[PDB]
Amino acid sequence: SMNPPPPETSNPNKPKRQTNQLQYLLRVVLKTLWKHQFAWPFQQPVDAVKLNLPDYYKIIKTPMDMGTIKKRLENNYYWNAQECIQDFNTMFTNCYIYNKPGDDIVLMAEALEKLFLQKINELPTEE
Ligand SMILES: CCN1C(=O)c2cccc3c(S(=O)(=O)N4CCC[C@@H](O)C4)ccc1c23
């Protein structure tokens, strides 16, 4: 059993910006999801050795989690809000790919995804 390297959270050659929408994705969107009762399985990269999921990284090839997103946001990693939203979408999609409808973890992702969409339905205006 071997975990892969987790996704990067810094990259000096990547272009980045500090926009009002990205600030909101950290202060409001991420920090609200983070406190939800169903958030904890999503707060760090899947540790497939700890969790005894040896097929996880056989199936999931673009891993993503809210801990990585949080550090990317805190480290000014993104150029725009769409990039960050894409990471959220990847996290949710990975969960549906690796699992099945009805699994507890899937019920958890579905709840978070609906909350996520509710929060990004309206974003602040790129001042
Ligand atoms: C979101 C990333 N991710 C998966 O894709 C996934 C698949 C099966 C279990 C599991 C666990 S768990 O064992 O801690 N637990 C979580 C709560 C519900 C339980 O059924 C299982 C934590 C995080 C996970 C998984």
Condensed summary:
With about 130 residues, the protein is mainly alpha-helical.
Would you give an account of this structure?
With 127 residues, the chain is mainly alpha-helical. The chain has one domain (19-123): Histone Acetyltransferase, Chain A. The protein is built from 5 helices and no strands. The chain has helices spanning 20-35, 56-59, 66-74, 81-98, 104-120. Helix 1 (20-35) packs antiparallel against helix 3 and helix 4 (81-98) packs antiparallel against helix 5 (104-120). The longest helix is centred in the C-terminal third of the chain and has 18 residues, at 81-98. The radius of gyration is 15 Å and the shape is globular. The protein starts with 19 loop residues before the first helix and ends in a 7-residue tail after the last helix. Bound molecules: ligand 99L. It is classed as transcription/inhibitor. Keywords: BRD4 Bromodomain 1, inhibitor, TRANSCRIPTION-INHIBITOR complex. It forms a monomeric assembly.
Break the fold down into its secondary structure elements and pairings.
Elements: H1 20-35, H2 56-59, H3 66-74, H4 81-98, H5 104-120
The structure holds ligand 99L.
Ligand 99L binds at residues 41-42, 46, 51, 95, 98-99, 104-105.
Protein name: Bromodomain-containing protein 4
Site (Acetylated histone binding): 99
Domain Bromo: 17-123
Question: SSE order, as H and E?
Answer: HHHHH
Per the principal axes of the C-alpha atoms, what is the gross shape? globular
**CATH architecture verdict:** Up-down Bundle
By DSSP (H or I, 4+ residues per run), the number of helices equals 5
Task: Profile the largest sheet.
Answer: none
Bound molecules: ligand 99L
Family: Belongs to the BET family.
Subcellular location: Nucleus; Chromosome
Site (Acetylated histone binding): 99
Protein name: Bromodomain-containing protein 4
